[PDB]
Amino acid sequence: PDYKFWYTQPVPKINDEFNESVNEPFISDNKVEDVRKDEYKLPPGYSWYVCDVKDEKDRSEIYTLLTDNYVEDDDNIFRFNYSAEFLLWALTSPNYLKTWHIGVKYDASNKLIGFISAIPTDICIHKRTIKMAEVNFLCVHKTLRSKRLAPVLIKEITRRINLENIWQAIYTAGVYLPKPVSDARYYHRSINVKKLIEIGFSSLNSRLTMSRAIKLYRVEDTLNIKNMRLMKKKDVEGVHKLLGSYLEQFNLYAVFTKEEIAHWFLPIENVIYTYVNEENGKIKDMISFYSLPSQILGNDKYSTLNAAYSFYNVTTTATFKQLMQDAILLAKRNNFDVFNALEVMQNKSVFEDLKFGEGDESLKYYLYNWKCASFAPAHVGIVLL
Numbered sequence: 001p002d003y004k005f006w007y008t009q010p011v012p013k014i015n016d017e018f019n020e021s022v023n024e025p026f027i028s029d030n031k032v033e034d035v036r037k038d039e040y041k042l043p044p045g046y047s048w049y050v051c052d053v054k055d056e057k058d059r060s061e062i063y064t065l066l067t068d069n070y071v072e073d074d075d076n077i078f079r080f081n082y083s084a085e086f087l088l089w090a091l092t093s094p095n096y097l098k099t100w101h102i103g104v105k106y107d108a109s110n111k112l113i114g115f116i117s118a119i120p121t122d123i124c125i126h127k128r129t130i131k132m133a134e135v136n137f138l139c140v141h142k143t144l145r146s147k148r149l150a151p152v153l154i155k156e157i158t159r160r161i162n163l164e165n166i167w168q169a170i171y172t173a174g175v176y177l178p179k180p181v182s183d184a185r186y187y188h189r190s191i192n193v194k195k196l197i198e199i200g201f202s203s204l205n206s207r208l209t210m211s212r213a214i215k216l217y218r219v220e221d222t223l224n225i226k227n228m229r230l231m232k233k234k235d236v237e238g239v240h241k242l243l244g245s246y247l248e249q250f251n252l253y254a255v256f257t258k259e260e261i262a263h264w265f266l267p268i269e270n271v272i273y274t275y276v277n278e279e280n281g282k283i284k285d286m287i288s289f290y291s292l293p294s295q296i297l298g299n300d301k302y303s304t305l306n307a308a309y310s311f312y313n314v315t316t317t318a319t320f321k322q323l324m325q326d327a328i329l330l331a332k333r334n335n336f337d338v339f340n341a342l343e344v345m346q347n348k349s350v351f352e353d354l355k356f357g358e359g360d361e362s363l364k365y366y367l368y369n370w371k372c373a374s375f376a377p378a379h380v381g382i383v384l385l
């Protein structure tokens with residue numbers, strides 16, 4: 001590929017590799033006063049719109065755009081169906097800016113046809129903590145693809161982020177762009193076997209009949225960690241200590257404040273599930289996963305694949321395998337069809353024994369305006385929604 005847009009940006013070229021001693025911006029000594037104050041030009045008939053995600057109607061417009069036009073798998077069987085409540089949660093983390101929730105409308109219909117978002121977070125990359133924007137939910141309507149709208153959205157959110165004296169960003173994508181700092185395959189653990197077979201997600205054969213498949217993935221409805229329970233507000237301090245200490249081992253992670261722990265982990269039904277094990281009033285283990293359904297395209301019987309996505313999991317009183325087995329059980333108890341996880345943190349070590357299967361694509365991790373050594377995904381300690 002030519003990367004005609006991306007090679008104008010402060011990112012590595014596709015062949016760039018850096019030693020471990022390199023960990024710095026491509027462009028330093030940036031000045032807020034020099035940042036463009038004018039919005040990037042859109043094609044005629046289109047206008048910028050500042051979305052208010054706390055307004056139900058604006059939020060529902062983003063929801064509809066994404067439901068109809070957001071990420072599909074490689075085979076166009078599934079399309080992500082983030083719920084409106086999920087989008088509210090994902091976009092209103094501590095210190096969020098409404099002006100970083102950027103829509104594009106088609107003037108004649110007043111309809112949203114494009115979106116991009118960012119939230120602020122402190123990111124530790126190779127032991128150096130940098131204030132960054134986390135970019136997500138970039139979407140252009142299917143009818144307007146390949147018209148170079150996405151670089152306009154990217155340049156406009158870059159401009160707005162730079163106005164806040166922030167010069168780095170983290171983002172993930174499935175497409176290969178210049179240039180990943182890490183690449184993580186995803187793995188799936190079947191829960192509702194029959195449904196997964198009926199929609200083509202899973203397969204049978206003459207050895208693995210339907211009944212044998214169901215038996216293979218059967219789970220015992222008893223926790224390894226008996227007192228694992230839904231997180232409560234009182235647990236924020238202990239989760240902050242447990243997770244914050246755990247994450248320091250990785251090459252890439254968010255440095256969460258207590259306010260961020262409360263936001264990202266306190267349970268919201270059909271959005272975010274966090275469970276904790278409290279011993280002596282101290283939090284010693286945690287499980288978390290978020291709800292991300294995929295619409296099943298064209299299916300007559302099922303509209304939705306109800307998937308739970310591994311988020312952050314820490315154990316000090318059990319094995320990581322026992323902890324993730326409990327995560328699968330808790331996902332089953334909450335009526336999820338499948339448990340999805342990336343090969344980040346310690347996850348890959350449990351995939352074989354817990355009967356995960358390898359998926360057909362991977363998620364790449366990227367930094368904007370940062371040069372450093374890349375790393376295997378076991379060194380990644382951050383999950384983007």
Ligand SMILES: C#CCCCCCCCCCCCC(=O)SCCNC(=O)CCNC(=O)[C@H](O)C(C)(C)COP(=O)(O)OP(=O)(O)OC[C@H]1O[C@@H](n2cnc3c(N)ncnc32)[C@H](O)[C@@H]1OP(=O)(O)O
Nearest residue numbers: 003004005006137138139140145146147148149150167168
């Ligand atoms: C400091 C501060 C810095 C802040 C900025 C940091 C950088 C942020 C980059 C964006 C990160 C996005 C993270 C995500 O949210 S993940 C989910 C992506 N959401 C989807 O997968 C939904 C379905 N899909 C779509 O809605 C569209 O395909 C897209 C993704 C909007 C792309 O639009 P389309 O009409 O195809 O393409 P056009 O407008 O002609 O633009 C082509 C140029 O664009 C590049 N590109 C494509 N996909 C990208 C993508 N996902 N992220 C970034 N760049 C992407 C591509 O390479 C090319 O540029 P070149 O010529 O190669 O240099």
Ligand SMILES: Cc1nn(C)c(C)c1CCOc1cc(F)ccc1-c1ccc2c(c1)c(CN(C)C)nn2C
Nearest residue numbers: 071072073078079080174186294340341342384385
């Ligand atoms: C099921 C299913 N449904 N769909 C629609 C897909 C792609 C699958 C496969 C299953 O993907 C995953 C499974 C995991 F454990 C973890 C991550 C993904 C994943 C893959 C590609 C991704 C995204 C998320 C996102 C969303 N954040 C991260 C920006 N963007 N991209 C391009």
Ligand SMILES: [Cl-]
Nearest residue numbers: 221222223226
């Ligand atoms: Cl139990």
